[PDB]
Design an enzyme around this catalytic site. Structure first.
Site, PDB file in Angstrom:
ATOM      1  N   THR C 100       0.802  -1.217   0.000  1.00  0.00           N
ATOM      2  CA  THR C 100       0.000   0.000   0.000  1.00  0.00           C
ATOM      3  C   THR C 100       0.855   1.297   0.000  1.00  0.00           C
ATOM      4  OG1 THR C 100      -2.022  -1.057   0.942  1.00  0.00           O
ATOM      5  CG2 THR C 100      -1.865   1.300   1.213  1.00  0.00           C
ATOM      6  N   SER C 139      -6.185  -2.568  -7.268  1.00  0.00           N
ATOM      7  CA  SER C 139      -5.930  -2.722  -5.870  1.00  0.00           C
ATOM      8  C   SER C 139      -4.406  -2.831  -5.708  1.00  0.00           C
ATOM      9  CB  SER C 139      -6.593  -4.014  -5.396  1.00  0.00           C
ATOM     10  OG  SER C 139      -5.935  -4.519  -4.240  1.00  0.00           O
ATOM     11  N   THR C 140      -3.862  -2.271  -4.641  1.00  0.00           N
ATOM     12  CA  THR C 140      -2.555  -2.743  -4.182  1.00  0.00           C
ATOM     13  C   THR C 140      -2.286  -4.231  -4.527  1.00  0.00           C
ATOM     14  OG1 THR C 140      -2.381  -1.183  -2.304  1.00  0.00           O
ATOM     15  CG2 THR C 140      -1.162  -3.327  -2.113  1.00  0.00           C
ATOM     16  N   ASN C 141      -3.199  -5.129  -4.154  1.00  0.00           N
ATOM     17  CA  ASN C 141      -2.953  -6.561  -4.291  1.00  0.00           C
ATOM     18  C   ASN C 141      -2.674  -7.145  -5.690  1.00  0.00           C
ATOM     19  OD1 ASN C 141      -3.255  -6.466  -1.486  1.00  0.00           O
ATOM     20  ND2 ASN C 141      -5.296  -7.435  -1.528  1.00  0.00           N
ATOM     21  N   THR C 186      42.096 -33.801  -4.978  1.00  0.00           N
ATOM     22  CA  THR C 186      40.834 -34.258  -4.441  1.00  0.00           C
ATOM     23  C   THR C 186      40.965 -34.423  -2.925  1.00  0.00           C
ATOM     24  OG1 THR C 186      41.265 -36.634  -4.835  1.00  0.00           O
ATOM     25  CG2 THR C 186      40.228 -35.414  -6.587  1.00  0.00           C
ATOM     26  N   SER C 317      52.021  -4.689   2.737  1.00  0.00           N
ATOM     27  CA  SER C 317      52.870  -4.467   3.889  1.00  0.00           C
ATOM     28  C   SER C 317      54.294  -4.407   3.324  1.00  0.00           C
ATOM     29  CB  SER C 317      52.700  -5.661   4.833  1.00  0.00           C
ATOM     30  OG  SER C 317      53.269  -5.452   6.106  1.00  0.00           O
ATOM     31  N   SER C 318      54.973  -3.273   3.481  1.00  0.00           N
ATOM     32  CA  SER C 318      56.316  -3.129   2.911  1.00  0.00           C
ATOM     33  C   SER C 318      57.369  -3.935   3.678  1.00  0.00           C
ATOM     34  CB  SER C 318      56.703  -1.656   2.775  1.00  0.00           C
ATOM     35  OG  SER C 318      56.072  -0.875   3.766  1.00  0.00           O
ATOM     36  N   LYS C 323      53.928 -10.486  -0.355  1.00  0.00           N
ATOM     37  CA  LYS C 323      52.641 -10.847   0.256  1.00  0.00           C
ATOM     38  C   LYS C 323      51.513 -10.111  -0.473  1.00  0.00           C
ATOM     39  CE  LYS C 323      50.244 -10.680   4.751  1.00  0.00           C
ATOM     40  NZ  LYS C 323      50.953 -11.612   5.679  1.00  0.00           N
TER      41      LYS C 323
END
Ligand SMILES: [Cl-]
Ligand SMILES: [Cl-]
Ligand SMILES: [Cl-]
Ligand SMILES: [Cl-]
Ligand SMILES: [Co+2]
Ligand SMILES: [Co+2]
Ligand SMILES: [Co+2]
Ligand SMILES: [Co+2]
Ligand SMILES: [Co+2]
Ligand SMILES: [Co+2]
Ligand SMILES: [Co+2]
Ligand SMILES: [Co+2]
Ligand SMILES: [Co+2]
Ligand SMILES: [Co+2]
Ligand SMILES: [Co+2]
Ligand SMILES: [Co+2]
Lengths: 461, 460, 460, 461
Positions: C100, C139-141, C186, C317-318, C323
């Site tokens: 609504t 209607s909304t519905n 696996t 990360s220096s 990494k």
């Protein structure tokens, strides 16, 4: 008495008449978790046997497997497929090993039953060998998932029958209750008139969608990875064997199968299991909603909606008559909640595949066969112990329809909006029908019988 | 051969031998759904009998139930509590009826066993009545939930024992690997050194939080609504009977129970089950991650991380030696995924309460009793058949540690972050060690062997 | 400065420069829950406007609406369709009232914009009425669930474009890595040889399955209940109107729509939302495995599998050059988790329908549109910022394949199972390749170079 | 006009304007997924700045951070804690990185704000470095989860305040309806009498449980790993630094925080979040069932239960009076469903931990902070906008009680079971009250008024 068998870890004593062998014996010790064994999911046992028959036929036809050993193995598979030896499949459904224990339970049992047919003793693996002969050309990673897909296909008819049965029951009640006028309810507020029949036919309609979508979804399983062996590169299993094995497995199962498009993909992809569970999850959500309505529509007897009467299947007190607990639908909601829960289990399992394999297909098959069986029984019980016997409370449905404030709308073209709104307002303040209030304004009763007819509102042109 | 019983819906033929009656027989027909009968969850049967003993005793003490019947009902309950008559509890765990079917199954069996101890044949309900006598001052909606709670309380120990067993396995492998240096891994990238022992004691430390959280949560079940009857208003049960029945149920079960604060709230509230399903879910989530770490760490033998070696419980191919499929952990993972789903099933059920009652406790108790059992067995196997026999690859462990460019991290407190970062980049770019690069810049060889010992970096 | 509006609850002051009305104002005050408003799912706003255009047109052609009013409404609708007035849809997506508030947000806005395209004041509803005229025959519905279906249909493209994009990324890498040989795994245990190209083309392969299932599931949304009104009995709207509106909405949207089979069932069926949400759930499940694979294959640099290298998009990360955190697959992982939680939300909402309505379509539609937008962006990012720049580590891959024991199976028809199992065990026991042990036993170097070629093993 | 900055991947141009730098800017591009930024969860932005301030203060006290830079960093953290600079926190809550991007946003913004306090220009990192100074003695894997725990502790009050409000609204209606007699319902069947006030008081009692459980679960968050750095080994953070930072964070936040017992375990363990998510889920489950009970009791007006009236907050049509959509409960339900899904999202992230870190805390913290905020607002709205204004339809409640067949049991001591059962049966058949059948059997009306009192049955001694 026992016999003595040997694997790459050492020696053990297997009971003398057991058809399983050392590998199955270890797996019974390794995976003792649920007390639910492979024989609690027989469709997967039957399936493994069919796959094992198909391979033996293929190997035989390509002259890789000797005639006497093919005959013996085939006859053994046939025994299991016709449901013999079920008690020999003793491995926990919660087994680790991605299916290897199921494969070995089948390999060993087939081998020993094959030997019986040859007149040799159990454990004489030099003649029929569980890995060399029964597992020839194969891998856990293509036999097991193929059988898994096969088992779901094989147990498809139990849930289809159940849906059809529930559909047929709602249709009949839709027909019986066709002219039973009532008030429709939206957000649990009285809305506009509808019949009980249209409402039951709409339960029917929703489930007709389900049987179609389920069929459509099951078809994805006809695609198999038989021949891809360990990771989809099909090493150690020739192209001709894979071709032949699939043709054989189609003949045996009565289902037209085909090779999946990309066996490297198929080695690890569980996506189809999620999709299939999703449709079981959809059936459960929709089904639950129906069961809820039947609980609501029969609430009462006096202080509820009381529009329908479900058959009393549960004993009550002689001093408390009229109390009818909606006990079958309740049992249905529990099946639905469980089916939803199991569906999440499949999701977590499916998600946890790594690289060239999902390791958790046994958990998957166990949950899907479970949901399928539970849903089949819920729907079958719903239809015959409840829906078939439902009665309409005709007078009380009519009362609701006749008490609707919405009927006042039919008066607008006759007395004007302002005055139809007044009647509406008055009917609600005083608690009389629109019909009763309309009469007081000097409108004629046999005219109003036409104007405010609720069956006219429920059935459009 | 059959006997003829009568209920409100009419007459029915019941097998001679059967201790259950027409009400149970009907519920067996109505709810044939799963093939899992009440007897698969014996702690709830045992609990139902306990409650029936307590109720009977409290009714006898308030002179509502006469002595000969009391002596016979109690004897029959005892037989049930002692493991006799289990095969009589035949109703499907997926029963509708909010519990009435389990309740009536106990009433009818108790009455017929009570009749037997007292001389009379099955079905002489004029003497011992399933409803009027065995169910005296009771309603499904108070006796059943209380049995549910008691059944969970009594099943605590199977999970606590298994948690304590797994904790002890990890602690011991913790001590066994105390000096086994390896590289840590964050986001699956190489990080700073740690020992395998530290990792393992960490596993044991997380399951210690779990044993405590479990006690705390199980404690809410001590609160019972016995004597609230149908909706919480206490109708058909006196205050006197409630207190006495609780005192009695406490002595019988070995557990200090108490009356819940609001029997109206209690009649319908299922939050206690959600909370407890929730810690099981936590245990699952934690236990599954440990299983996963075990699978990852044992990956190989040659192209994995290969830091540990699980016992080979599954026989392998003679031509593929060194393949050890991490089969016990896999089995644990799968138990963990089933518990998580079960927790959602309890969620769905719990949320669907309506007004004075929640109609789905049969489902709830069945799912929680299952998950408790599966977790117990999963942890006990993990401990006995995996952890206890795990072995370290000591040299492959060590190798990931000494290789590491991370060894420069330990120079931050020496030469500041910046210069230490500078040393890190030069080693990685020039193919020299961090040790090699640092003497380059004037720092003592003597101090660095110590400062860049990876095992030193693992400890304060 | 305000204006004065009336509804059945009384009078309120509405901001002068607002196209919304008293009913939208009330809604804003009623469901202030999330800070997320209707404009945050603009596809639903556009759809609502299309349906309103469809209704006005059918109403016009059937002579229920006069031409001046038709043309003002239709023009207002076009403005919304074109992307104007979006800041006027202010209602919370967590709204109650089952549609609504969204329907009235549309009706009031359209009425008011229709009033200016007609030279009348805001709020002059005796000329253009939001209920009587803009909601005529509706209607909304039926309007709201038809808008939802349309919204979902009109958003299909974005997830389709993203799927195809990622498919192409993987395919391209599939070609690039065609000969890059490596060991399969696996259960995280070394298996048999495969090429990185095959592994990557399988990723593509699975996603092509997803494009077809998504399309196929989307088609279910093409069946609309428009015309069914309040509960599916068509009250207040004729057959001809419905037939005409569906024809007109098909033209407006560019999608061929059709009337659903049973309108009474349609009023409450949320099943299609469950099925669809299930395909998103499935995509997420497949996607998260892939992401997980990429994080795993890139683990290292030194002590993981080190088989591939993802473009560095964050700075490192220096103090640890080399990494590279797999930042893009992590972001995709998080999206996939969200989509799966989101799917449960829809599952609850779908299950909660009562009788002639399910009240919770707004929560369902919001979660779905979120999930779609999220997957669409996730997959685009994974394609452009990760997959397209993935580099293979040829030597480390090759070493994994050559050091494998699976190699020893190639020797079974050469020297027999027995002697080839012995070669396997001595290889593992001594830390040598199958090649190096086979060379010891005297087998020809040039026959062995072909025999134990892992690349050869990868292709049937 | 822009400025020029540099990281280990090259250079980029940042708005002269901005307080964040190059790293935050890349994160903006890399993680554009939701349009929900860090500023949407300000509690975290504030908590990060508390941790940042604690660490600076600790470093300063051990002579490792120069006094001028300490003073400047602290004044900057103070500004963020006080709600300034919120729009500089621009990274997506869906960030990859395990929290690194949120940490770096904190670092950069603090550095540039500190620089301004020293009258230095934006990006002068030689004076205040985001890593070297603002991140000193810290890792992302200890600062970020600490900030996360504290964001949830800072936030606890809004949900606790909302719960107390809802509790209060229910308690007051409990009192007001103390004597409004009605029929109780079990499995939607008429049961025995109970007062509406009892029903409402039960709501209050159950939410009182939730406040106690929420409080006690939130206390797990007081255990922090600040100073364990990367993986729990503490490398680069002294014992003294850690001791001081925690003392300091405790002072800044007003919460007695303590170091967790095992920093290695704590580096990866997401169990505390699952537990917190779970009690939110539990609140949702109960809140939702209360919403449902409300929507059901208010169903009608004429063909439902109709025992209560919810305040009409949504407008209706003048021709359709009496129709009241239970609009606020509906929005509560929807919230409850969201929280329950959000709980599954958390469970996925939690299960997904790997070795020394769980990478998915940004998603976890976002979902829990959303969930908390929604629950708070829903419970507040339910109290102010629905409960506080609820009305009893008193005669309809009283009619439910009088229509109840359970009244016949009161007649047993008077006329024997057989006759009592006969009355119940006759009332059921004819739609008459037990009182009416009883009178027609020649029992006295004023006697029966006493005997069959529903209000005596609702209230034990
Ligand atoms: Cl089966
Ligand atoms: Cl048990
Ligand atoms: Cl959108
Ligand atoms: Cl926040
Ligand atoms: Co069995
Ligand atoms: Co059909
Ligand atoms: Co059994
Ligand atoms: Co202990
Ligand atoms: Co409680
Ligand atoms: Co906005
Ligand atoms: Co295409
Ligand atoms: Co696939
Ligand atoms: Co449908
Ligand atoms: Co924003
Ligand atoms: Co308090
Ligand atoms: Co912890």
């Amino acid at each position: 008495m026992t016999r003595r068998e040997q694997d790459s870890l050492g020696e053990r004593d297997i009971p003398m008449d057991a058809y399983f062998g050392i590998q199955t014996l270890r797996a019974v010790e390794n995976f003792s978790l649920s007390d639910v064994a492979l024989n609690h999911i027989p469709a997967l046992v039957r399936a493994l046997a069919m796959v094992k028959k198909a391979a033996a036929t293929a190997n035989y036809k390509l002259r890789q497997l000797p005639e006497p050993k093919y005959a013996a193995i085939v006859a053994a598979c046939d025994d299991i497929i016709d449901g013999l030896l079920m008690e020999q499949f003793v491995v926990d459904v919660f087994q680790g090993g991605a299916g290897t224990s199921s494969n070995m339970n089948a390999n060993e049992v087939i081998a020993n039953r094959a030997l019986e047919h040859l007149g040799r003793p159990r454990g004489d693996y030099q003649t029929i060998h569980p890995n060399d002969d029964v597992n020839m050309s194969q891998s856990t990673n293509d036999v097991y998932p193929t059988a898994v897909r096969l088992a779901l296909l094989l147990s498809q008819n139990q849930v289809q029958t159940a849906l059809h049965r529930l559909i047929a029951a709602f249709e009949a009640k839709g027909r019986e209750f066709a002219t039973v006028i009532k008030i429709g309810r939206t957000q649990l507020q009285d809305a506009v008139p509808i019949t009980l029949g249209q409402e039951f036919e709409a339960f029917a309609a929703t489930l007709r969608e389900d049987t179609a979508r389920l069929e459509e979804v099951a078809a994805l399983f006809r695609e198999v990875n038989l021949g891809g062996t360990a990771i989809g590169t099909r090493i150690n299993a020739s192209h001709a064997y894979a071709e032949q094995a699939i043709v054989e497995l189609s003949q045996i199962s009565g289902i037209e199968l085909k090779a999946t498009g990309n066996l490297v993909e198929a080695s690890w992809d569980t996506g189809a299991f999620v999709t299939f569970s999703g449709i079981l999850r959809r059936i459960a959500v929709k089904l639950s909603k129906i069961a809820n309505d039947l609980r609501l529509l029969s609430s009462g007897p006096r202080s509820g909606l009381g529009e329908i009467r479900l058959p009393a299947v549960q004993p009550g007190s002689s001093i408390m008559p009229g109390k009818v607990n909606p006990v079958i639908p309740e049992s249905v909601n529990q099946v639905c909640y469980q089916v939803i829960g199991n569906d999440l289990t499949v999701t977590m399992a499916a998600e946890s595949g790594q690289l060239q394999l999902n390791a958790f297909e046994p958990l998957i098959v166990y949950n899907i066969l479970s949901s399928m069986r539970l849903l089949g029984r819920a729907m079958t019980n719903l239809a015959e112990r409840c829906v078939d016997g439902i009665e309409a409370n005709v007078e009380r449905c009519r009362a609701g329809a006749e008490e609707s404030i919405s009927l006042a709308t039919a008066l607008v073209p006759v007395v004007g909006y302002a005055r139809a709104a007044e009647i509406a307002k008055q009917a609600l303040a005083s608690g009389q029908t629109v019909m009763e209030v309309a009469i007081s304004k000097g409108l004629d009763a046999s005219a109003l019988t036409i104007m405010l007819d609720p069956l006219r509102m429920a059935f459009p042109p």
